[PDB]
Amino acid sequence: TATYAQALQSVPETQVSQLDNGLRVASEQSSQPTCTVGVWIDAGSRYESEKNNGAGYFVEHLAFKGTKNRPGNALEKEVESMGAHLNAYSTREHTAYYIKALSKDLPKAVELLADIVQNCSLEDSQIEKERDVILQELQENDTSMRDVVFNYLHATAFQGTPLAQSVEGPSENVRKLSRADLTEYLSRHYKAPRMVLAAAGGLEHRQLLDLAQKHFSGLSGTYDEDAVPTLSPCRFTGSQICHREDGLPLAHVAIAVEGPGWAHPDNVALQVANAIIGHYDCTYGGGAHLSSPLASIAATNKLCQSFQTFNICYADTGLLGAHFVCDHMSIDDMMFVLQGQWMRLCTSATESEVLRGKNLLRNALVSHLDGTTPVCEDIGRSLLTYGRRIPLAEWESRIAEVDARVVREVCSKYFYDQCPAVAGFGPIEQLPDYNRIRSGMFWLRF
């Protein structure tokens, strides 16, 4: 026998350690066969200027095509013949390259990764081959209404800030982008302390730490003159950006109010509140018997195709709300039932309700951590986000502190009378007027 709690306390702690330059070394051990070593660099899309808006994102395409030590196909053929998989993902705040492999392959793994971060053989040919490809990718991104709409939400959420640009990077910059510029970018932002080299599975921390090629380090200040935040707040703006295209079949709306950064008591409590609203699809087996009254109502009344609440965590700001897809004739009822669930949450939360949304959160947050790659991520990212902590076991404690009053007062700070940030892509003709959305944030009636 063994019980949830117990389990929790019995999970393998994460070892954070540090190289002379500030290379961060984490790892969770399990002594099992495949490993997923990763380097989680944290200079993303929000450091890019207007020009280099998609500079990082470009580096990514180059990341795996050569290293002075491995021109051409070397990288890949090396990864392949081992049977390892190599992925690059880039956000607006975090770039990240990682390797999945057999646990005995660390030797060559970690050497490869480290090689990748630093030496990237980039010729005029590869730059001009990657331009054409990203211009094509942009063209394909436009085909995506989810993507197109969430970009919009950031743009308008954060008008006139560096964080509202498209990771992908503004079309034409790609054309223009000077070859020198990639350098400056990397040089300036790939310098840990920023980066963390994390990993999970069968490895011994000890070795990891040791195995980190100590080759180049942060070329930065020792005093406060660095102190000028590179992470300067981004100004919060409650606008809408409506982009009508009656030629498209369905409607995409992203509504969110601004939230807190990565680190905050209120930020787990929010999750438990989104637990309650939920997330629903054309294919959910429970339709009408779902417990989230939003779900139930679109299930029952064919009100929507798919909706999903989200909490987009950033340093200086956030994005928090729902997103729904639906017919052109359904936009307003969807908007009604949604905001209505928000409001009823900050004024009428019941202990039963919060209690269920609590538990859900536990599970979402345990189940994601199944597997080596997920666990890597948690570790890597978790150290630029929340710093070095591994709050995993605390969670259940923190999660457990939620009496429904907690969930309700937390909820009202962000939602109640806050100006929502709205974005949709036609047919939006029925999408509420900004003033209607707004008064949808208080409760006189409706």
Partner: peptide, 22 residues
């Protein structure tokens, strides 16, 4: 829940309203 508090302010309002108004 929040109804008592809110019903209490709503009861206040009606009261003072009559009192004054009337």
């Amino acid at each position: 829940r929040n109804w008592v508090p809110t019903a209490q302010l709503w009861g206040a309002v009606g009261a003072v309203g009559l009192v004054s108004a009337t």
